[PDB]
Chains A and B, each alone.
Chain A
């Protein structure tokens, strides 16, 4: 069972170069092994074996290589790869991007130790997604609805409120409460500035939701290997909570754009040639190894649902990071600069947004029977309303028909009441659908062509 053998400590440093220390005379070197370095002044650092060849090992040090020398620095080889302790005691805790506690609680007692690389889920064992995850935000739950076992990115840009949206989803998310303690969140944040990291930690304590949440913070000036490890600690925790403790886990991964910046740096440290657009050629297989740690599985009552969050340069959707993410994930939620400039929050644009699994999450016994019809009709009215608003500047408001003036009234009240929501306002799917009907009632019921007569008969009229 146990590893049992005593550790070897070497003073055989051959060279130091960039983030890398090279050692010789190492006994049967193991690839990806964790090692501990002690510096000439007694300072301690750690690193991982990046390559092996004969008696030589090269170690990438997580902290700097400064103050290291060939004579006095010692390196202790631990005999094993990186494994994380894991338990249900991790809900209510804050960790850094190496899994160390930063909440003044004690260190984790393991229920198990797991290899952070994981293993791929067998395609035979993955069952299709089903019921809703309720985020509490009407532009998502009402029109871009999220299924248990889905993976769906938020696409954003620098200076837009995507961290305020992520924090609101984390505070508000759950199951629909139709007619649970089996819901949990793993929140992971990569390359976070200290202002943003203090906001996440403060907002979840202040608004009292930590008992559902495991939080991993990696800051903008933490080691870039801890950024590579951070999604893997988060997903190794979500896999224990979902597929051994039977929870529904929501995973929020924050700036996969920051993750790719570290991946490009570790690739450069291996002396690989830069790939297409400057990212590693293997970046699809790498991102797919994160995003496919998701789903429902046969014979176990838990699931993992992922919401990756990304920042795009130039607001350009065709860059490798959002483009490769689109080939792996199943939808997008789009955060818009124009709604943000118009002082609307959350500035989610429903016309380019899509959830590809929405039909599997919504309807009788999962939300409400009218949800699909209301979602289809609200999209159809908004797409016409934006087209009437454009022609109003060409033809003038006196050339508009009475029906154009109804779409022009709906457009204003949709954005002020459905899309606009407070950062601490939580709407169930039922409240979202009722706000949806208040807007549809602006029209004569003959206009509502996407809604069948049975749904119009049950829901168009007000009642005491």
Chain B
């Protein structure tokens, strides 16, 4: 019971730590680059107007 738990629990930690890393290194930076582009383009439209 301890070894079937331990081997099943080790897998779920790896999958979870991979999501914490992917959100920190891949997903959040893509949102921040998008959001920085939008602000830059809205300054352009304002200067054209």
Contact = CB atoms under 8 A, between A and B. Distances in A.
Interface in A261-294: 274, 276-277
Interface band, chain B: under 10
Contacts of B46: 276-277
Contacts, number: 3
Contacts of A276: 46
Nearest to A275: B46
A274 to B, nearest CB: 8
Nearest to B49: A274
Contacts of A277: 46
Interface string A385-422: 00000000000000000000000000000000000000
Interface in B7-45: none
Contacts of A274: 49
A277 B49 CA distance: 11
A44 to B, nearest CB: 40
A230 B46 CA distance: 31
A427 to B, nearest CB: 43
A41 B11 CA distance: 89
A277 B42 CA distance: 10
B17 to A, nearest CB: 15
A351 B36 CA distance: 27
A232 to B, nearest CB: 31
A431 B8 CA distance: 55
A274 B49 CA distance: 9
B27 to A, nearest CB: 19
A153 B49 CA distance: 33
3 contacts: A274-B49, A276-B46, A277-B46
The 3 closest A-B pairs by CB, nearest first: A276-B46, A277-B46, A274-B49
